[PDB]
Amino acid sequence: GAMGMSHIQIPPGLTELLQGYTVEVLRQQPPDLVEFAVEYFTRLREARAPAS
């Protein structure tokens, strides 16, 4: 972020999760980040689609 938090940075949760998952793409499958992510997140939706 920028020094002096007057210039607000918006981290609505997805941002930190996104970073974690972007590390997942980078660490697990460096050449193709997206194919891994797509499979991982489709698997995510598959395994856990929000049920209330």
Partner 1 sequence: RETAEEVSARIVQVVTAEAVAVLKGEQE
Residue 16 binds to its own copies (criterion: CB under 8 A): no
Q: Which of its own copies, partner 1, none does residue 41 bind (CB under 5 to 8 Å by kind)?
A: its own copies
Residue 32 binds to its own copies (criterion: CB under 8 A): yes
Residue 26 binds to its own copies (criterion: CB under 8 A): yes
DSSP class of 29: -
Q: Tell me how far CA of residue 12 lies from CA of 30, 31, 33, 43, 46, in angstroms.
A: 26, 28, 23, 23, 24
Q: Which of partner 1, its own copies, none does residue 2 bind (CB under 5 to 8 Å by kind)?
A: partner 1
